[PDB]
Amino acid sequence: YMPTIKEGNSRELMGQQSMPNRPNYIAFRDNFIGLMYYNSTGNMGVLAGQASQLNAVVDLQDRNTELSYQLLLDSIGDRTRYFSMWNQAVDSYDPDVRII
């Protein structure tokens, strides 16, 4: 709350109150999602026998391998646990915050 717009220190200004800025975390994705190009045939990955450069990796725009990996990780193992090798730590909200 800024009581007055008059620049420079003055008698009114001493009443101003402060408030801490909002929290804002920043890090990589849940599994470095988006770090590697996936399902974009423009910049598609390649893995071919050096004799014949015809790549054996043929993606599509319809596949969603990121979400598929998310679901597979959920399926074949527990998910609440954290693995720091590939940032494996699924996102979630505080249930008391989502529902009052």
Binding site: A48, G49, S52, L54, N55
Partner: peptide, 9 residues
């Protein structure tokens, strides 16, 4: 089908 990279000379 959709055949990916191949070829045996």
């Amino acid at each position: 089908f959709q055949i990916g990279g191949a070829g045996r000379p």
